């Protein structure tokens, strides 16, 4: 079921997809007790509880330190760094105007998750060809 | 102007014969220049639309 809230691309570094949010609160636990900035909260009193910023203020206007913990600790694409959007895979480049029907057609036809998930694992495996992950030490502060 | 039958073959060197054989390909390249540029454009479009990287990933992984 689609959540009645909009995606917040206000922040130049990360986005929030409410329709993909699973209210795990990993981001909320990180911002308050790990980063200890206390921007991220979840309004449970609402009909559809969602991850809020301050008093449901857009991320750019909010007290966001922009550390990026929330995106590190999120388990799915709900909290994601904007640098990956339409860049990670091969089929991800497709415009959302054509990719959204592409998804609806897939749901209608599919039988079980087992089969389509296996196909997705193949795109994920093909991703090793183009994406490289290299360990580095930050050239900013002496931390 | 006596009667003779011996024949002496000309010295087509290793690189000489090579340059003639290469010119053979270079001629068919010119003869099909039209289709060559057309295919290259099409191929550039396949990379443009991720078709080529999609296949590269497929074989690489
Ligand atoms: S970490 Fe991401 S997916 Fe999990 S509750 Fe927070 S916003 Fe939703
Ligand atoms: S980057 Fe922003 S949303 Fe993420 S933990 Fe830091 S202040 Fe909270």
Curated annotation (Swiss-Prot), chain A:
Positions contributing to [4Fe-4S] cluster 2 binding: 21, 24, 27, 74
UniProt binding sites for [4Fe-4S] cluster 4: 138, 141
Binding site for [4Fe-4S] cluster 3: 31, 64, 67, 70
4Fe-4S ferredoxin-type domain residues: 12-43, 55-84
Family: In the C-terminal section; belongs to the prokaryotic molybdopterin-containing oxidoreductase family.
Official protein name in the record: Probable oxidoreductase YjgC
Source organism phylogeny: Bacteria, Bacillati, Bacillota, Bacilli, Bacillales
Portion of the full sequence shown: 128 to 270 of 985
From Swiss-Prot, chain B:
Superkingdom of origin organism: Bacteria
Gene name of the record: yjgD
Protein name (database record): Uncharacterized protein YjgD
Residues of the full protein shown: 2 to 62 of 186
Species the sequence originates in: Bacillus subtilis (strain 168)
Lineage: Bacteria, Bacillati, Bacillota, Bacilli, Bacillales
């Amino acid at each position: 079921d689609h959540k009645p809230y909009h995606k917040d691309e206000s922040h130049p570094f990360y986005r929030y997809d409410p329709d993909q949010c699973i209210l795990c609160g990993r981001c909320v636990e990180a911002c308050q007790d790990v980063q200890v900035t206390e921007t991220l909260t979840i309004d449970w009193e609402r009909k559809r509880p969602r991850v809020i910023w301050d008093n449901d203020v857009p991320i750019n206007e909010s007290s966001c330190v922009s550390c990026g913990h929330c995106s590190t600790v999120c388990p799915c694409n709900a909290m994601m760094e904007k640098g990956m959007e339409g860049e990670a895979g091969y089929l991800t480049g497709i415009n959302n105007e054509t990719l959204r029907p592409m998804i609806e057609i897939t749901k209608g036809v599919e039988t079980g998750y087992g089969s389509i998930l296996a196909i997705s694992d193949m795109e994920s495996a093909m991703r090793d060809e183009r994406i490289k992950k290299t360990k580095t030490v930050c050239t900013y502060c002496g931390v | 102007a006596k009667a003779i039958k011996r024949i002496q073959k000309i010295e087509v060197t290793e690189e000489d014969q090579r340059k003639r054989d290469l010119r053979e390909i270079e001629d068919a390249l010119i003869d099909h220049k039209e289709a060559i540029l057309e295919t290259l454009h099409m191929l550039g479009h396949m990379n443009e639309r991720g078709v080529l990287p999609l296949l590269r990933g497929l074989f690489g992984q």
